[PDB]
């Protein structure tokens, strides 16, 4: 069955971003689209599941020279007294059948938390203690001692934007959407490329897919710089270099892990 074709038809226009990115991976003819998907009323229904007799009657009386309104009409249509009780018993039983398908912790080192990840003679204490004890025999010098005009003016100049302690562009708009779309594409493909990269996966069938994805990295990064070139030759302003870091770091991880694999071998 063409289940893949049916799913592609379903998502062709319902979701714009998914199909946009999937098509983009083919617009420049980067790779085959197989890997894309390889890696990644109520009343009538209730009666249908409730009454098997109604199911059989529907199968035998499928619309043929008749009308669904007439079929609806056929639905509602001491001997009768006991029939009602029997009908409730059977109907509740049918509904129920349809719903019934066939360590105390101990530690040895706690001061490590007291000094967490945050990083970092005797007569001196005596001298400082006595000196500070004798320091404050006089109090309330506020009248002049606390502040002076020259120091205050220096402080205000420092607080000025050009002073110390106080150091002090949305021009492009349409480029924003293009950058967002490119970032989404990079994320989409990096997701699969990094899906199993951190895990060692020392198996043949597991490593085959990482090798294929690593080649796909080369093949996608082949086309990325061409769009980069198109965008660059406009004004030579507001450089977009963050995208380069992702590609270069992915390449560095790829090559370093390749060297590590060779060393392990």
């Amino acid at each position: 069955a063409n289940k893949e074709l049916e799913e592609k038809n379903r998502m062709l226009q319902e979701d714009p971003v998914l199909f946009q990115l999937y098509k983009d991976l083919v617009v420049s003819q980067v790779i085959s689209a197989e890997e894309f998907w390889a890696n990644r009323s109520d009343i009538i229904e209730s009666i249908f599941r409730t009454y098997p007799a109604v199911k059989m009657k529907y199968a035998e009386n499928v619309p043929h020279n008749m009308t669904e309104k007439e079929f609806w009409t056929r639905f509602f249509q001491e001997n009768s007294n006991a029939a009602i009780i029997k009908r409730f018993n059977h109907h509740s039983a049918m509904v129920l059948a349809a719903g019934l398908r066939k360590i105390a912790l101990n530690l040895k080192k706690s001061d490590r938390y007291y000094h967490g990840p945050t990083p970092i003679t005797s007569q001196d204490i005596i001298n400082s203690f006595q000196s500070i004890r004798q320091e404050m025999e006089a109090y309330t010098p506020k009248l002049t001692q606390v502040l002076s005009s020259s120091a205050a003016s220096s402080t205000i100049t420092a607080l000025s934007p050009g002073g110390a302690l106080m150091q002090g562009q949305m021009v492009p708009n349409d480029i924003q959407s293009e950058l967002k779309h490119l970032y989404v594409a990079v994320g989409e493909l990096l997701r699969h490329f990094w899906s199993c990269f951190p895990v060692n996966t020392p198996f043949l069938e597991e490593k085959v897919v990482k090798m294929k994805s690593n080649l796909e990295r080369f093949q996608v990064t082949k086309l990325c710089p061409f769009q980069e070139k198109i965008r660059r030759q406009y004004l030579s302003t507001n450089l977009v270099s963050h995208i380069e870091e992702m590609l270069q770091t992915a390449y560095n991880k790829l090559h370093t892990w390749q060297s590590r694999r060779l060393m392990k071998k």
């Binding site: 409730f88 018993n89 509740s92 129920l96 719903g99 019934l100």
Partner: protein, 185 residues
Amino acid sequence: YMESTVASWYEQGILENIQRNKLLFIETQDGAETSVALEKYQEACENGRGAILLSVARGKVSEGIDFVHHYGRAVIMFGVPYVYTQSRILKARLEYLRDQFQIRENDFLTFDAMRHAAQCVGRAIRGKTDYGLMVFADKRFARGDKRGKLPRWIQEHLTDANLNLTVDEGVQVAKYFLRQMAQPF
């Protein structure tokens, strides 16, 4: 009487709403259907669907069955259980008791009703201290004679405050009591 009430509820929309809220099962004279219905009722109780089992006080099912925790949580009694006043066997049984041992006919009749009601309503307290409420939808039980003939353990718990609650008031107090019993000891 059960069939007549069920038929009236079916003609009205009350029965359909009850069916929506919870599953409904009914008792019949034939033992096979009774057993099948009760077997499905137990599974309904185990599951979250729930079940409302309509039965007759004199029915053999009422005496044979025993209701425990999460089984027959709320016991509803629709009408005082009285045998038909036409069965001539009870006429001999009753007038002979009046003639000998000196028991009033009404006294023995009310005793036969209260004993049967206690039999069919005392199951929910089987054991293990499993909560449950017994609601009697009949103003006759509010009469002093019925209360006096009621078993002591039920009657002493019963109080005048809740003796003749309206339908809505009874529902509210039942909800509150179920809240209280839900929490652990």
